[PDB]
Structure formats: structure tokens, C-alpha cells
Point group: D2
Chain length 387, copies 4
């Protein structure tokens, strides 16, 4: 099995719900990020063998948005492209899965990552084809139905976070403390210029979007503590300690280690291992724990071997449980902030956090890193990298 490297990465800024990218499609965001990821690898689009891209809320976008992104980025029509959906994990598992194909020898160079525009996701009318007949009918927000709710238990992803808060005894204050830290880390990182390298500007014909919109500077514990529960009466999970609804894309080039050598490409990192695992849908936020254990075992590593972690902040409640049960270094995870501050553009997020990880590892001169996400429906996915 040959080794695989991550040659390059680029992401758009993450937009707020109804914000910067209210009218800039997932495909357009993806093309912007893909073109730049290709340039950052010192290759041309014709050198991509195939594309494998995450995207969840794809209703009304036309056939196969991965193909749309690939062709829009200038990749020839001869190269295949496919969209994948493992919900919140899609943008990261595209990377690991592509690495599987390349390790096997069936591709040398792939475009991977994910794209998501939650603002532009549509409403649905299930009765429209054959009729409602009589009486009021369903008129469904596809974002909630297909993206932000659990189908097995018919409740919001936020209720799965409440389930973890209750079972792991994670208090409101503990959740708010994590949220506060996320905001302040993101504020500080943004102001120090630490997102400048990874971001590619989006040009709207002109308006230039090059800053993460969702970060809330001057968040305080006093403000967070006043918020009402968002999902459950007398709950603990609030808008302030939950991830945002957001728009963005993030793209990477992966290739065989031997191909990077041939081409004289200095990669961001080498892929060490990966893992995807399941848990009960009711506690989906715990998914990163078995996924990460699997990935570490495959690498012959323990958490003590990992220098830097990106663990997606779907909800503070789940994030606290994951950090505690994996024995992660509490200030060596999401060191430039997480999704509570930066946002959670579902099918992009796994690629977004990997991009942030890789650029931070390089600037710190870290050796090893880990990206992991929880996944609606009860899964986790993880990627371990080294440089």
C-alpha cells in the first residue's frame, strides 16, 4: 500500500447564515477554493485524476455538485467526479476515502474536500407531485430535515447534545466556558493574521469576502449565561454554546507520496491513518471517540503522540465529552477557535477544520495532528497526519 500526502489546502472564509454568501452558491464557493488548492499544489487541473467531494444540502443544485465544482475549476471532462454524504463528516471522509483509492493505486492525484451553502438550501413540498387533496400540508425546511435533525428519533441534533450533557454530567457553565474560549481563541487568531494564509478570497461581482464572518468578539460569560435554551425547555444547550449555521467550501489536493516527490511538491502533511465508527444516533456527538481510538490503533499511536487536534465543535456539550474521554490536551485542541465561533457549514466542515489544522501545524512546527468530527445519525470520522 503506498503512502499518501496532502499536497495543498484552501478554504473560503466561513459565512454567517443569511450573510456574506446568502447569494453565492455552494458550487461557486467550491470552485473558488478548488482552483486555489490546485495552484497551491503546483499542478494544473488536467493533472487531477478524479474528484470526491462532500455536500449534504444539495436539493435544487442540479446533478452532482462535485462534477459541477470539478468542471468549474477547469478539470477536464474526462476526469470523474462524485458527491458523498456522511453528513457532518463528509468533507473529511472525502480526504480519507480518496487516500484509500490512491494507496490502492487506482488514482495518483485527487481533488477532495467539501462545499455547503445552508443559506441557499430550499424548502420542500412533499405533497406537490400528487396533491395535498384537502387540508393544510407539510412545507419543510430541507436544512432542518436533511441536515440538522436526527431521522431515527425525530428531533434536532441539539437534543442529541442534551442527551450527552445529561449522561456525561456536563453543566451549562462548562458548556459556556468552552464556547467563551472558542470565541476568544478565534478573535485572537483572526486579529493576529493566523487565518490569512489558509483563506482564499471570494470575489462577488466588486465585493471581496476574506474574513470569517461568524466570530463574535467580546463574547463574555455574562452574555452567554443570559441566553435561553435553544432546543429543550430547561435545557443547557443554547445558540451561544452550539455551532452556527453557515456557508463555505474547503478543498485539498491529495496525491501519492511518490507522485509528490516526482513533481517536487512539498506537502502540507503525510496521511498516517484514519477511522470511521458508529454510536447510537441519540448520542451522535460521541462519535469521535470510537473513530479516534480506531485511527490511533491503526497508527500504533496514543493520544500522547498527537501534537495538535481539531475536533469539530458541533455543540459544546458533545465537545467536552469527547475531549475528556480521549484525554486530549485541553489547550492543544481548536487552538485558533472552533465551530461555535467560526461556524459549521455541514459538508464543508471536515475539510475546513483539516485546512486550519494543517496550516497551524506548519506554523508551530508541530509533527503530528488529528482532525475529527461527530456525525448526525451516530458516527464519527478521524484523520491522523504527520509532517
Amino acid at each position: 500500500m503506498r503512502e499518501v500526502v496532502i499536497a495543498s489546502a484552501a478554504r473560503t472564509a466561513v459565512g454567517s447564515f443569511g450573510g456574506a454568501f446568502k447569494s453565492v452558491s455552494a458550487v461557486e464557493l467550491g470552485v473558488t477554493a478548488a482552483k486555489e488548492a490546485i495552484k497551491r499544489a503546483n499542478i494544473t487541473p488536467d493533472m487531477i485524476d478524479e474528484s470526491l467531494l462532500g455536500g449534504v444540502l444539495t436539493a435544487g443544485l442540479g446533478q452532482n455538485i462535485a462534477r459541477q465544482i470539478a468542471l468549474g475549476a477547469g478539470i477536464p471532462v474526462e476526469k470523474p467526479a462524485m458527491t458523498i454524504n456522511i453528513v457532518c463528516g463528509s468533507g473529511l471522509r472525502s480526504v480519507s476515502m480518496a487516500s484509500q483509492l490512491i494507496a490502492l493505486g487506482d488514482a495518483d492525484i485527487m481533488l477532495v474536500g467539501g462545499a455547503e451553502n445552508m443559506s441557499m438550501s430550499p424548502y420542500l413540498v412533499p405533497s406537490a407531485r400528487y396533491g395535498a387533496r384537502m387540508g393544510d400540508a407539510a412545507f419543510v425546511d430541507s436544512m432542518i430535515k436533511d441536515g440538522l435533525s436526527d431521522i431515527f428519533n425525530n428531533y434536532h441534533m441539539g437534543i442529541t447534545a442534551e442527551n450527552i450533557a445529561e449522561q456525561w454530567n456536563i453543566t451549562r457553565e462548562e458548556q459556556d466556558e468552552l464556547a467563551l474560549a472558542s470565541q476568544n481563541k478565534a478573535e485572537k487568531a483572526q486579529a493576529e493574521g493566523k487565518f490569512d494564509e489558509e483563506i482564499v478570497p471570494v470575489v462577488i461581482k466588486d465585493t471581496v469576502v476574506d474574513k470569517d464572518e461568524y466570530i463574535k468578539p467580546g463574547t463574555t460569560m455574562e452574555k452567554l449565561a443570559k441566553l435561553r435554551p435553544a432546543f429543550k425547555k430547561d435545557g443547557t444547550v443554547t445558540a451561544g454554546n452550539a455551532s452556527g449555521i453557515n456557508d463555505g467550501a474547503a478543498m485539498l489536493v491529495v496525491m501519492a507520496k511518490e507522485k509528490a516527490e516526482e513533481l517536487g511538491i512539498e506537502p502540507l502533511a503525510t496521511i498516517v491513518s484514519y477511522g470511521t465508527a458508529g454510536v447510537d444516533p441519540k448520542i451522535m456527538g460521541y462519535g469521535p471517540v470510537p473513530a479516534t481510538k480506531k485511527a490511533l490503533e491503526a497508527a500504533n499511536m496514543t493520544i500522547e503522540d498527537i501534537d495538535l487536534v481539531e475536533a469539530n465543535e458541533a455543540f459544546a456539550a458533545q465537545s467536552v465529552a469527547v475531549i475528556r474521554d480521549l484525554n486530549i490536551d485541553m489547550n492543544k485542541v481548536n487552538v485558533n477557535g472552533g465551530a461555535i465561533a467560526i461556524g459549521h457549514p455541514i459538508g464543508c466542515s471536515g475539510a475546513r477544520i483539516l485546512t486550519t489544522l494543517l496550516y497551524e501545524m506548519k506554523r508551530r512546527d508541530a509533527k503530528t495532528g488529528l482532525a475529527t468530527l461527530c456525525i448526525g445519525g451516530g458516527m464519527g470520522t478521524t484523520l491522523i497526519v504527520k509532517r
Copy 2:
């Protein structure tokens, strides 16, 4: 790289648009087929490592229908599941891609295939979230937008068939002759009992659906010749010489050859090779040609080495071009009929035609077989098998 076998296959009957499965969801169809594919492999659901399933028109179905099918079939919550979209090719590339993962050693046993309910696909309101403001607004059939039209050229898949009819000089009569033969082959096969083994009944709480609904017995050239063009004024492509709109699921168990040996499983076939390739979106129906050339080259085979072909009949116009340019045996392809007669439930079809191939190879005592499909957006995918 280890060898991979197809342990088992099962499909539902294919329903007509608004017909047998008007109210039986893609997930319910998938669960029915998956449970039976698992039983036909002499394994239990806990023995599945992960599931990889095709599905295209998934709006309003909730998170990740592959996970829904897996859990509904009794596969434990610990096993991952992911949905893929390479349009019309999804149900076949799930099989080849799973084989890649198993060859590499990262899975031993997987549930693969696809599920699609076109009848139940919803209408969309793009302006619903932020408002239409003033004046009439878009109200979009997701089936047409996301399934049956080309996004690059903004026209129906049927126009891509007209493009091939014009460029390859495939006449109306030639298209109707293929359609006629498809109908009569399907009629004859159904009446002789040749679909009995592969089909699993769907039980609606009771009504039992166990017959392919869409076949039109007593089709004639006179009837076909009277039909009006469906897509283009003065065109050649009609409802009669085009695939149907349809509902169905088809599921298979794939596993390492060594695992089948261990378990004493007699497989339907061994996977020989695969290929996925691109063409211009305008001529998407030609995709099977480069895909199949790639697969044959990988196998060190020529078309002369292949005993039986399933080539999905998206449109007679494209099907004639594919058969002619691959030098396929004209009566050794779709020998029990094709999608003009049986239907084209988009994300299921690749798994549907593979199921029909495998059961026919076994009954004929054929040695080698090939399944291939054209793919909206300009692709093809192929799988070569041997027994």
C-alpha cells in the same frame, strides 16, 4: 491487493412512476432488498463492516439514507454508512468502490447497491427561506432539476440523447427497433420466470409487489412509430424509446474472496475490474465507451472475452451508439430486456442491472460478464465480473 467477490444480490421489483411504490419510500425499498441480500449471503447483519449506497433524489428523506437503510436492515449502530451520488452510476459505483476498500484491506464485508423513489421526490421552493418579495417565483420539480436534466447545458437528459442520435446518425426507426426488442425480451423473460429468483417481494400493509410493473407487453413497431418526440420538436427520442421514471432498490453483499472461503459462501461472481470515465456533458450517453475500454484494459481483456453484457438503456439513441462502438454482441446484451421496458430508478439502476446480470450469468453457466451505465454530467461506469 486481494480479490473481492459478490456474495449475493437481491432487488425489489421496479415500480412505475406513481405506481406500486407511490407511497413506499426509497428507504423502505432499500431495507427490504438489504435484509434479503444479507440472508442470501449466509451472514448476519452484524457481520457487515460498513455500507456504501447510491441514492440521488434524497431531498426531504432525512439525514443520509444509506445509514437509514443499514440500521433498518439490522446492521449495528457501530458500523458506518454513507450515501454516494454519481447520478445514474451510483448503484454500480457503490459496488466497485466498496471493492477498492476491501482490496486495500480496510473492510472485509460491505453492503452495497442503491435505492431510489422518483415518485416520492419533492418539489422545491428556492425563494422560501428569504422570500419571493414580489411577482411569481420558481417552484421546482427536484426530479427534473437534480436527476433528469444536465446542469451545464440546462436541458433534459433526453436532449443529450438527441445529440448522440444526430452525431452518430441513429435513426428514429433504429431507436424504436431497440425499444421493441427490449420490451419483447422483458415480456418473454418475465413470463418464463427469469426474474423470479432475483426479486424479493415488497409487502405493503396486505399487498405484495413482486412483478416489474413497467414492462409493456404487446408493444409493436406500429405503436412506437406513432409516438410524438418527447424532448425536441421534430426529434427522434420519444417516451417509447426512452427509459422510464421508476422506483426501486437493489442491494448486494461484497466481501474479500478469502472471507467468502472462510465462511463457505459460494459467490455469485468474482470482481475482475472496473472503470469510471468522463465525456462531454452534451454526449453523456457515450460514457460507457471510455469507461468500458478502461475496465477491459485493466482486466487485460477485450470485448470478445465477455459472455454477457448489461448496458443500461437510458435512451435507445445512446444505447445503439454504445453497442456499435464497443462491438458488443447485439443479442448478448440486455438479454432479459433493459430499462426502456423495466425502468430506470436512477440511483438503484446500476445495482439493478448488476443483479439481473449475475442471475442470468449463473443460469446460462456463462463465465464472464460486464455491467455499464451512462451518467448525467458526462460519465460512464463499468464493472467486469467472472464466475
Copy 3:
């Protein structure tokens, strides 16, 4: 104040919900009836001074359907036309109100009546203009919201019928007995040809609709008694003892008595008096009682002076209460059946029952007659006529 006569009347057959007029608009039905009412008066359309027409469920029909009907019937553009909405009473109060204008001297000849197509009434999206923002939204059947429910108490008109059943002690069996009689009277009248004169055929380009569709021959008490309550758990009101949902139009020509004399027109009847009155919305079905008392007082009559009654059968429960409290002759009311059998096309019904009254009075050689309807929102309206 001068006297006013009803010169002529014509109605379409009443169609079933989703039936004969599923695709024949309220305006088209109205034009058919209006043209024939004009001919039955021995006048030309230019002789109409103005039109006043009922119609309730007018969403999406374009500006002012009375004007559409008038112009479609050939009435000159110079003649005004206006639509009125007093819900179920609209088609009758158009007649009385026109008579007020003519009595005063401000019109000599008017087109009156009503038109309604419940099948074609649309669904509504209240959030569409400014957006739903997030989460599922309302998708409203305008027929139920604007036609068949009480806005003050937010429940179906059928619940107002339950309120009367409870307060007046009208049993399920008593309701079913009235329904049975309605069906059998309608069956018998239709078969004997008694609707032949009043109906004008509707020609659909050809299909001719000339029979009341909704009548259920061979209704029996056994069948009625098996029906489930339609509106309230453990209720008394069922689909069988409630009015139908229906489509139809009915049009009349009214004119000053002196104008009919001048023109040598033999009128169907002379208007004696009218009345419109209110009750609590909760008991709207009782409206005919105060309305009729008012009309009788204005005429210096008692119910004993009335030879024939049409009292619209919105619900058997309310109809029994009205007949009992007005001391109506139980077999001198709705003698050819009522709306349980024939249907209730809301804005047409008042004109429909008046048309049936006038033709039956003439054939019986009756002298006096009365039409009355209950009205959603808590009203009744009545017209007394003589010949």
C-alpha cells in the same frame, strides 16, 4: 319604492369535488349560466345595467370575477360589475341587494347570482413574500381557511353543526333521517326530469355536463349509520349527513316590475321581502331563523303563508333545528332534495336553491316561496317570492 321581479334563472349542474368541473373555472361556469339566464329573460346583454355576483374562494382567479363573468357573457364594458362575499349567503344576497338598488331606481335590470369552484381553489403560502427563515412553515388550503372554517373559534363549520346538535338535542339518527330523505328526494326528482328545465349544459371541448353529479342513489340508513364522525371524536356529524364540497354557478335576471311589463316578460316570481340577520358564530347554522322571521315580518306574513321552502342543507344538524324552530312543513322544504344530496358550492348555493325553488313553484302552481341559508361567521339570509 317600486316592485322587483325575477325575470329568469339558470344554473349549471352541480359538480362533485374533483369531478366534472375539476378543470372548468368558476368564471367559465358563471358565463355559461349568465348567457342562458339572459336568453331566458328575452333580453340582450346590453340591456343589463350592472352585475352583482357572489363568489367566496376567489384566490388566484384574477381581478373581480363578477366583471369577468359579465364581460364573458357579452355585457358591454360600460356596465359595472362587483363581487360580493357574505360566505354561504352570497348567491342569494346578490339577488336581494340588487332588488334594493332596483327598488330605489338606480338600476332597471341586473345580472345576479353566484359562482364557485371549490376544486380549483388554491393552496396559500403566507410566509412566501418575506420568507420562512428557518423551520417548517404554513401551507394552507384556502378552501378550508376562507370557506369552510370559522375564524373566530378556529374550527371547521362542522363543529358549529355539532354545537347545534348538542344544544338543540338533535340526534345522529335524526340527522341521518334528514340526509336519507334528501338523497331519495333528489334521486326521485332527477329521475322524473324535474331538474331538466333549470339546468343549462356545460360544454367542455366534446363532453356535455348536464346532470347533478353528487347525488348518491340507493343511500340507505344502514350505510349512513356506519359512517364515522367527520369533525369531532364521538360526534354526530358525518360526511353523509353534511353538505358536500362542490362546483357550480347559478345566475338570474332581476328587473323592475314595470320594466318586465314594458318588455312583455313573464317573470318567474315577484320579490316580496328579504332579511339578513346575525347569530353567534358558534351556532351559525341557526342564522336562517332570525333572518326568516325578519323577512316574514317585513312581508306581513307568517310561515303559514308560505307554500314552498328551500332551506340550504349545510349540515343536517342545523337544518333540523331551523325547520323545527320556524315550524316549517317538513315535506314542503327541499322537495327535490337539498345540499346533502346535490352539493354546496359556497358562493353559488344561494342562487342554486333559489333557481330550484322558482322552477318547482311554477310546476306546482304554488303561490308563495321562501329561500334561506345559514352563513359562516354567524348569519342567515332569506328571500320571499310570490307568483
Copy 4:
């Protein structure tokens, strides 16, 4: 025939489209105005015999908004209420029609006027009941379809204004001059306090709305001249020289002159005459001319006998034609501005302009006045009053 007086009048401020009353329903606006009109007549709600109210865009508002307004204003359930639709004329013809009923002796005291909330008018789905079946479907703005377009010619009311501009040779500059004057007159009147008396505040639970929102102070000819045509390529009619889309209600109490005497009510004015007339739909904006000629003839008056005119400014193009052909005093019409500045809440406007007329007549000590409006579908309606 007895004489009829206008005892009192009250109107809400007129809101901008999506503005002050974006969420304050037509019924709520109507109730506010009705309660105050009743108080301004020195009567109690139980003294109202019946209500007759205009309203056009009533989809989804529930049964019969006149009844809703009446009951909400405290009028007893015994008193009838009916909604009328003669499009733009509805709020004025309610007044004249009520006067007909009172002159005849069938009512002594009525609540009249109109209410309209264009912002809150819904979108419609004609195919929703029985289904769209396949392919995109209609999704219709009820405001445009039922309020702001001509059904006979299937084009916007603004095109009827272009038709008049062309046929009467009314230039862009002439239209803009009228618009400019409307804005400046309204600005000046508002600033001088001249709307203070007629307006009743709307209290939103608190926010108080008591100023006409739509007036554009500092409008200039330079600004107006830069606007693009709104309805026709190379047209003359723009957003600046057309009426607005707006929300509001206006209510009046009318009663027999002898009843006002009995009660010691000093009326705003006595009704002299009225008229409603038709023209071709294509030139609907001309309707006021025959309507006004009819009203003047009935009064034995000429335009020279009229001291003050309110002629609704649907479009400057039509307004210029009406003023010129009626020989109106150019600065004795809309002396406090018109609908270009103040707005055109369709079913309210006739009552709105009458309210403004009556209060201005009183403050000027004028003797005679005239209100007139053009009406979509090709009509006009007029009321002449004296004090």
C-alpha cells in the same frame, strides 16, 4: 328617498410595502379605524345596523373580513356584515352602496369603508390540491394576480397607464411633474399637521404608527427623470410616477340625515350623488371620467360647482388624462397630495381619499366635494358630497 349623511371618518396612517404594517393585519387595521369612526359619530357599536366593507387581497384571511372587522370593533353578532370587491373602487363604493340601502329605508346607520394589507397578501399554488405531476409549476403572487394586473389582457395595471399615455399624448415629463407636485403637496400638508385630525394611531404591542410612511420629502425632477420605466421597455411609467403598494384601513359611519338630526350629530357632509361606470379594460385609468359625468348629471351639477376634488392617483398618466378631460381645477385636486406620495392600499383607497376630502373640506370651509377612483377591469366610481 331620504337623504344620507357621512357622520364621521377615521383612517390609519398608510404604511409602506414591507413597512410599518408588515405584520399588522388588514382586520387589525380595520378594527382600529372602525372603533374610532364609531366614537367620532357619537354612537355606540350596537347602533350600527350592518357593515359593508371593501377588501380585495383577502386570501388566507379567513371568512369574510368585513364580519371580522365588525365583531372586532364591538358591533353585536346580530348585525350583518359583508365584504365587497370592485377592486380599487371598493372602499368608496361601500359608502355609496350603503347610502342606497339607507335611502331606501332598509338601514338607518352603517359602518362602511375598506381595509387592505398588500404586504401580508400570500403566494398561491394552483397545482397543490391535485398535484403538479412532473416539471416545474406555477407559484403565484396573489397581489399581482388578483390586485395589480388586468385579467382580460394579462398585463400589469401599469400597462393600462402606458396605453393612456400613448393615446392621450401624456409625456414622461408631464407625468413626473404631477408626481413631483403630489410629493411636495403631501410633504407640506404632513408638516403643517393637516393629516393629524383624520388619522387614528395604530398601537403595536409598544410602537405607535401615526404618520403616513410612504411620502418622499425632497423628491425632485432630477431624481424622477433618472428612474427607469417600471412596466414597458422604453415606457413612460416609472415607480416614481406610479402609485405605491401599501397597507391601511379607512372607516366611516353613514346614516340617514333624519337619524343624525335625532341624535344631534353634526355630520362631515351630506351625500349628493354617486356614479359607477365602465370603460374598456385596456384604458381602465379613464374610468373616473364617465363615472363622474354620471354623478354630476344625477346631482344637476357641473364640474364648476365642485370646490374640492380627490381623484386617486393610480398612475400619473391616467390622472393627467382624467383632470384634463373633466376640466378639473389643477390645484383644487389632491390638495394635500395623492397616492403617488401617500400610497394605494387597494381596497382601502376609496375610503382613504374620501376621509382626506372630508377633513380638508371642513378646514377650508368648502361647500362641495368629489371623490373618484379608476378601477382595474375598466371602471370608475364617484361620490359627490356637500356641507
